[PDB]
């Protein structure tokens, strides 16, 4: 079944798929951008996990008034990096 239009054919699609797999799949999951490292390298996530569990609990307890306030608190914590690093300090 050879000679299936071998005019720069299967080799081109092979190179294209190799390039797209190398650039998109393995590269993205293998290394991290310098913007991400500031979020990934938190030394202690106990406080953030406690806040998220607390907002889940207050949502469950049918107290939607405080859920919005806790979400705003989390948004502000994730916005300002100084407050994030201060809040994430170990012990």
């Amino acid at each position: 079944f050879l000679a299936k239009v071998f005019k720069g054919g299967v080799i081109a699609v092979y190179l294209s798929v190799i390039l797209v797999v190398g650039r998109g799949l393995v590269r993205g999951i293998f290394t991290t951008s310098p913007s991400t490292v500031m979020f990934t390298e938190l030394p202690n996530a106990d406080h953030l996990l406690k806040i998220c569990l607390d907002i889940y609990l207050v949502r469950e307890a049918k107290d939607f008034m405080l859920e919005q306030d806790l979400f705003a608190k989390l948004i502000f914590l994730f916005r300002s990096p100084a407050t994030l690093i201060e809040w994430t300090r170990m012990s």
Partner: peptide
Amino acid sequence: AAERDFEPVTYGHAKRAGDYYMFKYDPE
């Protein structure tokens, strides 16, 4: 020495010991 908290023992505690105190000097 009066500002730092915790003592780095394991590798994880050493990699994340960054604080402001050691950056309080002019680069030159």
